[PDB]
């Protein structure tokens, strides 16, 4: 099957900086692979760049995107993060910072229970502290759960709207994991998370005219039966697989890749958005961009390391692999 991917975004008029970024992931898909890295938010400034500059050092250059997380910007308790401003602009500064040097803003967010009532993203079925949280009820209006998701969406819309105003365009990937069920927002299946999805896209897009964003759509794993998941090729800019191998496993998972194209009909540039040990560039399995976790997942630990010194090095020097010193500047 012919790839058929669209050469604009699903956002009408995208900002200058998206268009750019887009136009960058759909010339560069299959051709190279993206290097990234993620980080951990949270009351630790010394560690906002941990990963990058652990990268420079070790292995000669900076990956090309960065991860960020809003988990800290909302929720039960998070006064401390949101009401500081050591950390209030950390993700918005980060993305600043990553952008201003030409690289790529990966945001996500573990979305704290929006009623308050734990501080929990977790869900029932995921054998950790929940939050009974109902997206069936989120996603209907005039509820309390519904109030609760909008009210969230505007302080994080703040935060998107001061990175459209400084010119920064990211990749968002809301609502990640969904299938899996283990957050609240998947937990009651393909329903709720498809109009959820729409609601926040809606609100971004059109409500907020939040036109910086290239929008990653995460199907799996678990990927059986994604298709029921799918937001639609007008709200998904990017298909996002989190494949958390054996530890020290850098197969390409090609498998997982031909399903992406297979599933999306070739409609949509595919990327590893979150993994433990990273797929061994290969353009046989050519992820746009891979993103490992933060902390031992990109810092090797111990005798079977996630992503060795050794492994590290000969990625980073790999000609398939865009690091930031290859970005042209936005
Ligand atoms: C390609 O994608 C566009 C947009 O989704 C769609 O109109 C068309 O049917 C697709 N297939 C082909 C063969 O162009
Ligand atoms: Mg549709
Ligand atoms: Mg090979
Ligand atoms: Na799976
Ligand atoms: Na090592």
């Known amino acids: 099957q012919d790839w058929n991917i669209s050469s604009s975004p699903v956002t009408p008029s995208p900002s200058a900086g998206a268009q750019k970024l887009y136009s960058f992931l759909v010339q560069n898909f299959q051709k190279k692979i993206i290097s990234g890295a993620m980080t951990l938010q949270g009351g630790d400034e010394s560690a906002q760049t941990k990963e990058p500059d652990w990268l420079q050092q070790n292995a000669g250059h900076r990956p090309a995107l960065v991860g960020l997380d809003f988990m800290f910007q909302t929720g039960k308790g998070e006064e401390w993060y949101y009401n500081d401003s050591r950390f209030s602009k950390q993700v918005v500064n980060g993305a600043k910072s990553y952008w201003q040097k030409g690289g790529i803003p990966a945001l996500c967010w573990h979305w704290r229970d929006p009623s308050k009532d734990t501080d929990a993203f977790y869900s029932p079925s995921s054998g950790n502290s929940a939050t009974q949280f109902d997206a069936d009820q989120a996603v209907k209006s005039g ?8 009210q969230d969406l505007a302080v994080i819309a703040d935060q998107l709207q001061d990175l459209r105003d400084a010119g920064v ?6 609502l990640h994991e969904a299938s899996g069920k283990w957050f ?22 059109k409500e907020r005219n939040l036109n910086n964003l290239i929008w990653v759509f995460t199907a799996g794993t678990p990927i059986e039966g994604i298709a029921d998941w799918y937001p639609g090729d007008d709200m998904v800019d990017v298909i996002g697989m989190d494949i958390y191998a054996t530890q020290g496993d850098h197969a390409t998972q090609q498998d997982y890749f031909n399903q992406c194209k297979s599933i999306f009909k070739g409609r949509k540039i595919v990327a590893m958005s979150e993994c433990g040990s990273v797929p061994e560039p290969d353009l046989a399995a050519p992820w746009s961009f891979f993103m490992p976790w933060y902390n031992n997942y990109c810092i090797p630990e111990g005798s ?7 492994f590290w090095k000969k990625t980073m020097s790999s000609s398939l692999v865009i690091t930031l010193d290859n970005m042209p500047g936005w």
């Open 143 to 150: 509820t309390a759960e519904n109030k609760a998701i909008l």
């Open 169 to 174: 365009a990211v990749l968002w990937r809301p």
């Open 184 to 205: 609240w927002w998947g937990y009651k299946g393909a329903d709720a998370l498809k109009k959820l999805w729409k609601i926040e896209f809606d609100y971004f897009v």
């Open 304 to 310: 079977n390391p996630y992503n060795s010194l050794e």
